[PDB]
């Protein structure tokens, strides 16, 4: 969030460091979820669905390697 | 403790009675008693000034200490009594040296408790000390407007005043009405809130209970005659004028306050 430009730094890299710091901190991603209200019911639904999909994609990717030589 | 009464008869149908088993039963402390005759709403001219007042039951004025300016010597409360001249209860507090007084009963205080006045006292419900030592945010009661005049603010059944600021010489406090008022720092106030808080829960039940309190019935203006009241007159339940007092002053909305002397003390008007 607080990105002070060091001595003798180009504007392009100075802004790139700010952008990377913002992306790592996740500021733009917090407003996109705090703009509207999400009930605990749908919050748990989304969490469970995301976990299931994350589990299934990994399992499918690991199980698809031992088939279809090329 | 509010007790619902059985509907054995009309008048008993809707009565509830606030009962405190800790209240003393018997005669009060005779040396501190006095005489308080019923005025009846008549000033020193025989004219009725505040109507709807009269009758009731004989009472006796008990001397209640609203100052508590005894620094040092701590006293102990012995019992509580019901004061007919007010809505709260009075605690009979006796000092270590022989001396009994009547104090406004705090919320948590019961029989056998100890209270110390002065400005060397400790923060505890019942103690009295100036605003210069009371921490900000405290809920005091029986607040004095000026040093030595006596406690006047928030001394009802269940009222209190909370401190919000103190910038040296003046201390800002929010009264029970909901407005802030600066007071001198040297003023004294008892800690905590008054004891009997269920007083508002009582209901009279019948017209007789109001005559017991000593309030005459109130007659609506619209049922009177035009000479007796502006709202009077008509060939029925007619009413075609703005609601006003019997002396031609607006009732609904009209703010009646002209005291300009006490205007620098008020921080914000009540809302």
């Amino acid at each position: 969030p607080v990105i002070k430009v060091r001595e003798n730094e180009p504007f392009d890299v100075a802004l790139r460091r700010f952008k990377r710091s913002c992306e790592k901190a996740g500021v733009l991603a917090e407003v996109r979820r705090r703009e509207f209200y999400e009930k605990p019911t749908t919050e748990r639904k989304r969490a469970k669905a995301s976990a299931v999909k994350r589990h299934a994609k990994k399992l499918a990717r690991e199980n698809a390697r031992r088939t279809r030589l090329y | 403790a509010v007790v619902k009464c059985k509907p054995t008869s009309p008048g008993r149908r809707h009565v509830v009675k606030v009962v405190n088993p800790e209240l003393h039963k018997g005669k009060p402390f005779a040396p501190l008693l006095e005489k308080n005759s019923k005025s009846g709403g008549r000033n020193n001219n025989g004219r009725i000034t505040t109507r709807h007042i009269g009758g009731g039951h004989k009472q006796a004025y008990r001397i209640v200490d609203f100052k508590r300016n005894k620094d040092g010597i701590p006293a102990v409360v012995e019992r509580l009594e019901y004061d007919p001249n007010r809505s709260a209860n009075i605690a009979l507090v006796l000092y270590k040296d022989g001396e009994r007084r009547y104090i406004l009963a705090p919320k948590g205080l019961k029989a056998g408790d100890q209270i110390q006045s002065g400005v060397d006292a400790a923060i505890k419900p019942g103690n009295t000390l100036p605003m210069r030592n009371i921490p900000v945010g405290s809920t005091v009661h029986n607040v004095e407007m000026k040093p030595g005049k006596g406690g006047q603010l928030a001394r009802s059944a269940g009222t209190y005043v909370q401190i919000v600021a103190r910038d040296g010489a003046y201390v800002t406090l929010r009264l029970r009405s909901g407005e802030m008022r600066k007071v001198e720092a040297d003023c004294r106030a008892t800690l905590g809130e008054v004891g009997n808080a269920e007083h508002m829960l009582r209901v009279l039940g019948k017209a007789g209970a109001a005559r017991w309190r000593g309030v005459r019935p109130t007659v609506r203006g619209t049922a009177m005659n035009p000479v007796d009241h502006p709202h009077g007159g008509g060939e029925g339940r007619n009413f075609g004028k703005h609601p006003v007092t019997p002396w031609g002053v607006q009732t609904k909305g009209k703010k009646t306050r002209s005291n300009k002397r006490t205007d620098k003390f008020i921080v914000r008007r009540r809302s």
Partner: protein
Amino acid sequence: KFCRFTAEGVQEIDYKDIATLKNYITESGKIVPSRITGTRAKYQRQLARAIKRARYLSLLPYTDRHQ
């Protein structure tokens, strides 16, 4: 599973320590998730409480700016 504690045996994270505790908070005053730190479930759970205690005692800032 206490990767940062296997060779140390601290067994108890104390909010007094800040030198080895500020490595678990990012520049914006946020705790690095155990998914990234590789910390044991109990050690990360107690380290979060220690960081909260430090923040209460004003040893670690709540946010990057904290005006």
